[PDB]
Write an enzyme that holds these catalytic residues in place. Structure first.
Site, PDB file in Angstrom:
ATOM      1  N   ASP A  88       1.048  -1.195  -0.111  1.00  0.00           N
ATOM      2  CA  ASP A  88      -0.089  -0.037   0.115  1.00  0.00           C
ATOM      3  C   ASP A  88       0.918   1.262   0.011  1.00  0.00           C
ATOM      4  O   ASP A  88       2.163   1.152   0.235  1.00  0.00           O
ATOM      5  CB  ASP A  88      -0.943  -0.300   1.114  1.00  0.00           C
ATOM      6  CG  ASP A  88      -0.407   0.083   2.460  1.00  0.00           C
ATOM      7  OD1 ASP A  88       0.893   0.253   2.583  1.00  0.00           O
ATOM      8  OD2 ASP A  88      -0.985  -0.669   3.432  1.00  0.00           O
ATOM      9  N   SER A  89       0.149   2.468  -0.059  1.00  0.00           N
ATOM     10  CA  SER A  89       1.130   3.543  -0.267  1.00  0.00           C
ATOM     11  C   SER A  89       1.420   4.070   0.916  1.00  0.00           C
ATOM     12  O   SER A  89       2.433   5.161   0.908  1.00  0.00           O
ATOM     13  CB  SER A  89       0.282   4.884  -1.064  1.00  0.00           C
ATOM     14  OG  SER A  89      -0.675   5.587   0.011  1.00  0.00           O
ATOM     15  N   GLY A  90       0.991   3.905   2.102  1.00  0.00           N
ATOM     16  CA  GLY A  90       1.315   4.524   3.546  1.00  0.00           C
ATOM     17  C   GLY A  90       0.210   5.445   3.865  1.00  0.00           C
ATOM     18  O   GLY A  90      -0.175   5.897   5.209  1.00  0.00           O
ATOM     19  N   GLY A  91      -0.468   6.036   2.752  1.00  0.00           N
ATOM     20  CA  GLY A  91      -1.355   7.264   2.877  1.00  0.00           C
ATOM     21  C   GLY A  91      -2.544   6.821   4.156  1.00  0.00           C
ATOM     22  O   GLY A  91      -2.957   7.805   4.796  1.00  0.00           O
ATOM     23  N   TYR A  92      -2.906   5.749   4.077  1.00  0.00           N
ATOM     24  CA  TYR A  92      -4.060   5.504   4.910  1.00  0.00           C
ATOM     25  C   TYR A  92      -3.784   5.403   6.438  1.00  0.00           C
ATOM     26  O   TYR A  92      -4.485   6.054   7.295  1.00  0.00           O
ATOM     27  CB  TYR A  92      -4.872   4.039   4.665  1.00  0.00           C
ATOM     28  CG  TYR A  92      -6.029   3.927   5.484  1.00  0.00           C
ATOM     29  CD1 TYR A  92      -7.611   4.549   5.276  1.00  0.00           C
ATOM     30  CD2 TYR A  92      -6.110   3.029   6.555  1.00  0.00           C
ATOM     31  CE1 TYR A  92      -8.160   4.385   5.967  1.00  0.00           C
ATOM     32  CE2 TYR A  92      -7.150   2.795   7.424  1.00  0.00           C
ATOM     33  CZ  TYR A  92      -8.272   3.685   6.958  1.00  0.00           C
ATOM     34  OH  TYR A  92      -9.411   3.315   7.955  1.00  0.00           O
ATOM     35  N   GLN A 189     -11.772   7.198  -6.091  1.00  0.00           N
ATOM     36  CA  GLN A 189     -12.223   7.579  -4.853  1.00  0.00           C
ATOM     37  C   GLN A 189     -13.380   8.304  -5.055  1.00  0.00           C
ATOM     38  O   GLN A 189     -14.336   8.086  -6.227  1.00  0.00           O
ATOM     39  CB  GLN A 189     -11.481   8.615  -4.155  1.00  0.00           C
ATOM     40  CG  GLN A 189     -10.153   8.198  -3.497  1.00  0.00           C
ATOM     41  CD  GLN A 189     -10.224   7.359  -2.418  1.00  0.00           C
ATOM     42  OE1 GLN A 189     -11.491   7.235  -1.739  1.00  0.00           O
ATOM     43  NE2 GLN A 189      -9.162   6.868  -1.656  1.00  0.00           N
ATOM     44  N   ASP A 266      -7.673  -7.583   0.460  1.00  0.00           N
ATOM     45  CA  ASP A 266      -6.927  -7.771   1.799  1.00  0.00           C
ATOM     46  C   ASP A 266      -7.567  -7.518   3.088  1.00  0.00           C
ATOM     47  O   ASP A 266      -8.528  -6.667   2.972  1.00  0.00           O
ATOM     48  CB  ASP A 266      -5.577  -6.838   1.548  1.00  0.00           C
ATOM     49  CG  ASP A 266      -5.921  -5.476   1.788  1.00  0.00           C
ATOM     50  OD1 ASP A 266      -6.361  -4.815   0.798  1.00  0.00           O
ATOM     51  OD2 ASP A 266      -5.834  -5.078   3.063  1.00  0.00           O
ATOM     52  N   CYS A 304     -13.203 -27.807   6.509  1.00  0.00           N
ATOM     53  CA  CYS A 304     -11.968 -27.186   6.071  1.00  0.00           C
ATOM     54  C   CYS A 304     -10.660 -28.096   5.985  1.00  0.00           C
ATOM     55  O   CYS A 304     -10.649 -29.047   6.635  1.00  0.00           O
ATOM     56  CB  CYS A 304     -11.341 -26.117   7.178  1.00  0.00           C
ATOM     57  SG  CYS A 304      -9.895 -25.237   7.159  1.00  0.00           S
ATOM     58  N   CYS A 306      -7.310 -27.361   5.880  1.00  0.00           N
ATOM     59  CA  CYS A 306      -6.097 -26.859   6.297  1.00  0.00           C
ATOM     60  C   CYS A 306      -5.444 -27.775   7.190  1.00  0.00           C
ATOM     61  O   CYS A 306      -6.099 -28.808   7.826  1.00  0.00           O
ATOM     62  CB  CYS A 306      -6.311 -25.657   7.048  1.00  0.00           C
ATOM     63  SG  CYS A 306      -6.713 -25.509   8.766  1.00  0.00           S
ATOM     64  N   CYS A 309      -7.062 -28.276  10.831  1.00  0.00           N
ATOM     65  CA  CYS A 309      -8.350 -29.100  11.022  1.00  0.00           C
ATOM     66  C   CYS A 309      -8.115 -30.618  10.456  1.00  0.00           C
ATOM     67  O   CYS A 309      -9.030 -31.320  11.060  1.00  0.00           O
ATOM     68  CB  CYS A 309      -9.438 -28.303  10.039  1.00  0.00           C
ATOM     69  SG  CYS A 309     -10.028 -27.013  10.550  1.00  0.00           S
ATOM     70  N   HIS A 335      -5.533 -21.504  10.686  1.00  0.00           N
ATOM     71  CA  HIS A 335      -6.850 -22.130  10.105  1.00  0.00           C
ATOM     72  C   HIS A 335      -7.424 -20.842   9.326  1.00  0.00           C
ATOM     73  O   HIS A 335      -8.026 -21.093   8.356  1.00  0.00           O
ATOM     74  CB  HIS A 335      -7.600 -22.688  11.138  1.00  0.00           C
ATOM     75  CG  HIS A 335      -9.007 -22.544  10.909  1.00  0.00           C
ATOM     76  ND1 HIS A 335      -9.690 -23.706  10.072  1.00  0.00           N
ATOM     77  CD2 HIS A 335      -9.923 -21.604  10.949  1.00  0.00           C
ATOM     78  CE1 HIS A 335     -10.966 -23.141   9.937  1.00  0.00           C
ATOM     79  NE2 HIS A 335     -11.144 -21.996  10.582  1.00  0.00           N
TER      80      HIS A 335
HETATM   81 ZN   LIG Z   1      -8.694 -25.276   9.153  1.00  0.00          ZN
END
Ligand SMILES: [Zn+2]
Ligand SMILES: O[C@@H]1CC(F)(F)C[C@H]1O
Ligand SMILES: O[C@@H]1CC(F)(F)C[C@H]1O
Ligand SMILES: O[C@H]1CC(F)(F)C[C@@H]1O
Ligand SMILES: O[C@H]1CC(F)(F)C[C@@H]1O
Ligand SMILES: [Zn+2]
EC number: 2.4.2.29
Lengths: 372, 372
Positions: A88-92, A189, A266, A304, A306, A309, A335
């Site tokens: 990201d740009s840093g601005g937020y 925007q 994200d 799931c 993963c 799990c 998870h």
């Molecule tokens: Zn899981």
């Protein structure tokens, strides 16, 4: 020889798309969820299915600093992650975390919330810092407008953001090493106002970017309004480039945003939830500290895939979390990130098969019934 | 003002005794089990019920060395344990672990199994090293006789050990700081031979010690023979001083030895077992890796009071151990040491109440049935 940046759409269903972004450091499957890298080991994050991670420029420029990260070989070396990275740009975070020393069309000066040092950001400085980090996808530097925003404040911030978008474009293009190897996204925007969103989209497409983010959402407006804005905002962007909804979000936010043409996401949610004892499941989130899990031998989510799990029961993760054992938070976090990747995979597969609309209905019915 | 060393017998049942050893650093309840301190935190070891721990002089003199431990303030500071500490003499590990450079009536020279350095032990050097460590109970330096031993080898080692017992006595007495604040135990030898054991007991009582260990057992002879030797060996020792069976042992060894007049025990078993996934229970040992524990929500032992059994199920300790998580071994080790302390407490209480013979029968019936 993989290209700098190539987005291909393999299948569509209504406004939803699935495909790939090819970059020198790897292929990104879309729609894509980017974990926020700025802890689990990088091999663990990769094994969850993540194709790209996000770095927070603001945090990195405060500690250990962009020059130091470059001396250490760049952000990929620093993070132990050799696949694509979006910064990201840093601005937020300037708006949300720092104390502003000065703000104008030139850029911003701010005080570190850590040690009080003064720092400067601008289209040119942000792009330069992202170059020092060596990230693969670079975000233009823009000006955020709080929620709710007046039409005049939304308009002035959007207009400044578009002038800053041109400045970001030119700064990125000024460095052959960056322009030949990385990609640049611009950020739409306009708050909730259709005419400002169209103004912004037109300006961004005139400049030309490798991808287009929808900014200014997920900042307090609620899902209904977010979806209403996406309904008219996403079609304004170029169809043949990726669409990135920054900072979103909950699983149901992601599904509805893909229904509206978003390709990239994200969020810190999976990580924040995992540290706080909350797990995402197909039946909605659960709070693993609840007594009902103390003798529950089922995994966090019974579908799931993963690694957590496959092995660990709710009962034992409950025990770990209740004891304050860091392993508990690590397992929940792994998870959650993996669950997010499995959600994206089901989205991709269902769009490919032309049954994503049905998947979205089935998903909401189960997620909100909460029969966990 | 607590005394240097005062053993009081509060209750007897046959040959079994229960009481206390009062020392400057604390009270030791007998019969006593001493964990081997040479990892769990010291506050954890104390909370399991241990009143005293054992330090291995041989290991400490190799790393970091006795002079270094003294400079650091002594073994209590080094180990973070402010209650009594018993140190062995070092002589057993010389036989069992080192490579001997030289052996004679003077003492022994040996090579460190770590870095090959040469070290020397003797009655005088062993007592001096235990003084540098600052331990509360000091063991005389003796000469071990392997199992099985010929009567002539058993006799010559016992006779040397008795001359060395006198030398240990005189060395201990030569340092006012040690003699006024610590205690000295002598060690009976003689292998399985009644006449040598009586010879040894008579010699030790003539010298005079604060306590008397039975050495030369738990080195391959089997429980039946160990018990037969204890049957005639323990009554030879002074009745009004503690009796210490070194290096024993399994829970059933401890019960039968108390039936035969033993007051003190040490063993690495609880720790070694905990690191290897074996838990002691009233129904015998269990191997927590066994598949039958993967969904077993009961604690390791359903009567154990320890902190682990209040909270953790077999299922979750199984999961931890199978994953190689160090927490699993730590929990097993804490439970094993605590189980040993609870065994000693039941022994003490049952002797006090005059029902220890019955406790021992009930204990064996259940421990060996193995209905876990
Ligand atoms: Zn899981
Ligand atoms: O090259 C590394 C392999 C990995 F473990 F998955 C993380 C990468 O950065
Ligand atoms: O003084 C300390 C208190 C303890 F935690 F139990 C270990 C002692 O050495
Ligand atoms: O945040 C950690 C894990 C990561 F993969 F996200 C990058 C960094 O090594
Ligand atoms: O071995 C550890 C724990 C102990 F208490 F036994 C002494 C040392 O701190
Ligand atoms: Zn226990």
């Amino acid at each position: 020889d993989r290209p700098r940046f190539s987005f291909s759409i393999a299948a569509r269903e209504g406004k939803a798309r699935t495909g790939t972004i090819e970059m020198k450091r790897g292929v990104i499957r879309t729609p894509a969820f980017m974990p926020v890298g700025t802890a689990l080991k990088p091999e663990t994050v990769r094994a969850t299915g993540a194709d790209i991670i996000l770095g927070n420029t603001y945090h990195l420029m405060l500690r250990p600093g962009a020059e130091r990260i470059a001396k250490l070989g760049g952000l990929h070396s620093f993070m132990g992650w050799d696949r694509p990275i979006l910064t990201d740009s840093g601005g937020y975070q300037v708006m949300s975390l720092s104390s502003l020393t000065k703000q104008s069309e030139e850029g911003v000066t701010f005080k570190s919330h850590l040690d009080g040092s003064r720092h400067m950001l601008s289209p040119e400085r942000s792009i330069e810092i992202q170059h020092l980090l060596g990230s693969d996808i670079v975000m233009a530097f823009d000006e955020s407008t709080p929620y709710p925003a007046t039409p005049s404040r939304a308009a002035s911030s959007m207009e400044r953001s578009m002038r800053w978008a041109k400045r970001s474009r030119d700064a990125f293009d000024s460095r052959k090493e960056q322009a030949e190897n990385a990609a640049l996204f611009g950020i739409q925007q306009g708050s909730v106002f259709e005419n400002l969103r169209q103004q912004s989209a037109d300006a961004l497409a005139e400049i030309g970017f490798d991808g287009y983010a929808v900014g200014g959402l997920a900042v307090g407006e609620g899902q209904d309004e977010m979806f209403r804005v996406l309904d008219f905002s996403v079609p304004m962007l170029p169809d043949d480039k990726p669409h990135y909804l920054m900072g979103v979000g909950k699983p149901d936010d992601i599904v509805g945003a893909v229904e509206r043409g978003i390709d990239m996401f994200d969020s810190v949610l999976p990580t924040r939830s995992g540290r706080n004892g909350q797990a995402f499941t197909w039946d909605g989130p659960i709070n693993i500290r609840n007594a009902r899990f103390s003798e529950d031998l089922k995994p966090l989510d019974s579908e799931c895939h993963c690694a957590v799990c496959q092995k660990w029961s709710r009962a034992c993760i409950h025990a770990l979390i209740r004891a304050g054992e860091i392993l508990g938070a690590m397992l929940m976090t792994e998870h959650n990130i993996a669950f997010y990747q499995q959600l994206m995979q089901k989205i991709r597969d269902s769009i490919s098969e032309g049954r994503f609309s049905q998947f979205a209905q089935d998903f909401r019915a189960r997620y909100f019934a909460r029969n966990s």
